Design a protein around this ligand. Structure first.
Ligand code: 7D5
Ligand code: 7D5
Ligand code: MG
Ligand code: MG
Lengths: 191, 191
């Protein structure tokens, strides 16, 4: 099986191609953050919208969200979302999904196929929102480090986030809890 | 709240201090791998030992397993497990846990306290096993890159893993599925 190799190979898939970064980010670092953000968003949404989400399925979907990038590499969203490329790349992503875990024990292979092909629209939406939050957070950290090339990126992502918070109360709450002062300049909790 | 800052600050906590690495590893990369390994181990154990584990609680425990290292830094196990330091460092880790999420909404703060203070012995044990698997995997990748300084590390971790597989059938199955050929020299799944 290639499953464990793929989990570690995600460290070789860089994000933010075409942008200068003070800290290079790989898909594994990004995915760790997205799992944590997805969890927090889920807890806020459950309390706000009076429900219980299947957190096992959500966390697993966040965990493997970007696993197909071990084949596709990470195509930055200004490229991937071009009208010329949007639908072709989604078709490519589907071809990758269908071939990835080709050599597993069937109880395990079905569980992985279940995650990658999850048709739960709400779980898909939470992780998409988490992905946007994480990209915004990275842009905040780069600007904090002094990276002026990320100012316009932070502005674009922050504008979209602001528009999202008008339609999704759990995102507005997340923004109020964590994104108005991010990153923390003084790491008081270390001491 | 410091929660989101801490999630990203884990990228500044290096592992393997005192060892030459071809690839520097941080706690966020390691934690991503441990979440995935914990999931796989859980699925194997459920099928082998005829049970169902609360995977939400397991995945959350793996996700925040090392969060106190944002305060303690990552103390390598040959140091942390010295008889002089073993119990003091565990007491330190407990003091950190008690102070970490000091400024959260109570529904969220209780959920985080619930994770960090989880007294589920089986979940604790799965993640401890996942931690050992991940450390072994890292040592395999370093040796694969040509890092002779990791040969003795790989030998030590592999010896302990082998002894563990004699007592835990789900670990023996994991080893048979993934660890006999790791990492993959030819990344066929990319093509
Ligand atoms: N304004 C921007 N300029 C350049 N790259 C950007 C960007 N906004 C996002 N990215 C990159 O696209 C990735 C996000 O895509 P996903 O949500 O699919 O992970 C980001 C990191 O490469
Ligand atoms: N033989 C060895 N020589 C040096 N560092 C080692 C080691 N074995 C493990 N480490 C490091 O200790 C960490 C593992 O500890 P945890 O399980 O608590 O994460 C490893 C990476 O720093
Ligand atoms: Mg993502
Ligand atoms: Mg760990």
């Amino acid at each position: 099986s290639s499953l464990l190799d793929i989990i570690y190979q995600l460290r070789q898939v860089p994000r933010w191609d075409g942008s200068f970064q003070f800290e290079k980010e790989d898909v594994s670092q990004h995915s760790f953050s997205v799992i944590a953000i997805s969890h927090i968003l889920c807890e806020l949404k459950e309390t706000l919208e009076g429900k219980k989400i299947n957190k096992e399925k959500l966390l697993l979907y966040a965990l493997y969200h970007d696993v197909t990038e071990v084949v596709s590499t990470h195509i930055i969203s200004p490229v991937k979302k071009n009208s010329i490329l949007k639908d072709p790349f989604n078709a490519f992503r589907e071809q990758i999904k269908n071939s990835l875990f080709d050599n597993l024990p069937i109880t395990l292979s079905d569980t992985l196929s279940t995650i990658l092909n999850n048709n739960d629209l709400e779980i898909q939406e939470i992780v998409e929102h988490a992905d946007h939050v994480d990209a915004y957070c990275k842009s905040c950290i780069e600007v904090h480090r002094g990276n002026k090339d990320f100012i316009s990126i932070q502005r674009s992502l922050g504008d979209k986030l602001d528009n999202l918070t008008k339609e999704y109360p759990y995102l507005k709450e997340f923004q109020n809890l964590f994104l108005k002062d991010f990153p923390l300049e003084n790491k008081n909790y270390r001491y």
